[PDB]
Paper text:
The structure of [name] is typical of a NEDD4 subfamily member, with a N-terminal C2 domain for cellular membrane localization, WW domains for target recognition, and a catalytic [name] domain that binds E2 and mediates target ubiquitylation through a surface-protruding catalytic cysteine. At the cellular level, [name] acts as a negative regulator of bone morphogenetic protein (BMP) signaling, which modulates cell migration, proliferation, and apoptosis. Ubiquitin transfer requires a motion facilitated by a flexible hinge that connects the [name] domain N- and C-lobes. To gain structural insights into the mechanism of selective inhibition, we crystallized the [name] domains of both [name] and SMURF2, without and with a representative [name] inhibitor, compound-8 (Cpd-8), and determined structures at 2.05–2.75 Å resolution.
In the absence of the inhibitor, the [name] domains of [name] and SMURF2 adopted a highly similar architecture, comprising N- and C-lobes connected by a flexible glycine-containing hinge (residues G634–D639). Across all 28 [name] domain structures (including [name]), the α helix10 (αH10) comprises two and a half turns and ends with the conserved glycine, which provides flexibility between the N- and C-lobes through its high tolerance of ϕ/Ψ dihedral angles. To determine amino acid sequences critical for [name] activity, we employed a fast Fourier transformation-based multiple alignment. These analyses demonstrated that G634, which stems the [name] hinge, is invariant in all [name] sequences across animal, plant, and fungal kingdoms and in all 28 [name] domain structures. Function of the hinge is facilitated by its length and the flexibility provided by amino acid residues with a tolerance to a wide range of ϕ/Ψ dihedral angles. (A) In unbound-[name], I631 of the αH10 (and other nearby residues) occupies the cryptic cavity, which is therefore not available for small molecule inhibitor binding.
Author numbering: 377 to 438, 442 to 750
Write the structure that this text describes.
Amino acid sequence: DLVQKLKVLRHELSLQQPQAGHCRIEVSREEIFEESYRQIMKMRPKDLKKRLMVKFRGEEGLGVAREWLYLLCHEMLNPYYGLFQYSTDNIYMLQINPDSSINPDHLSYFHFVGRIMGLAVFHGHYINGGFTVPFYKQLLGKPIQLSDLESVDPELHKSLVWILENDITPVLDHTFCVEHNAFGRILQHELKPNGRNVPVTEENKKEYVRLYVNWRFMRGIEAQFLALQKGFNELIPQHLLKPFDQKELELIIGGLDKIDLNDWKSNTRLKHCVADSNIVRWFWQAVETFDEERRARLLQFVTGSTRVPLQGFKALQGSTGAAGPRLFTIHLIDANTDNLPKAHTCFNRIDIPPYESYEKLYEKLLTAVEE
């Protein structure tokens, strides 16, 4: 199982975390994207491996990287910024935008997104944002298969399938060079060192084919991916990803994308109330009533993030923030019943007033989650 292989990866990463010092990030909520960019990019990789201390500017009086990561991923992964775009054929998943060159500094922003992804995995946190299958395969360092290219370029796929099941000796005159229309002009690109003078033979056509497929998936997003990858590997070394596949990397990076209710209830603690308190009974009744989306907004309202750890609700306050696992807490406060439930994201605690009815609790709970 994944938690087993992950604990080996987390232990190797934990050895790289200097027990002395804190990685200090203080950004505003209204400028979280550009302020986090400036602060993270000013640091050296060694500085990012120190235990995280994220504070929102001003809000430190009356801090969590869980909420900061959530709000930061929400911003950087939005197509408004031109780094990522939704896929045409996977309208539910992000991919690198090939027209990212519009921003001349795009390569530094991709390197920053990579730093944020590595920082999240390194500190036991997750990234809210789903990527495509070739994104995870590329990030992992493993080669894309020829069958994955049929959907992307069926004419090139047809040609490369011909090469593999035919004797190219009396027919082909290819080199490890691909000539393509680069917007307005044809450009020769070598697939390997000195590819223009390396002919494709029966002895090396398998290598030529896998390099051509790899090159075609990187078309337009080469500089972008390289930048992201260098930021990600500054926290998560490439060798430590070796025991994982595309689906396992997607889970390591983003956590579970389904909230189990029984695990949420098993890892819930109560302050100022007991299991048979009306507020507790009513809260869980309102929670079964909520849809998968309303449940995720409730998790974000209380814990600061929509992300569920791969170990479940038991490991809620990630690897760093204060001491350890600060479990989801229901706190019955004595306060005016016209108030909305308060949330202390730093403790995964919801302060619920002593409502007089289930419907009263429901409407105030729903109203708090939409805000």
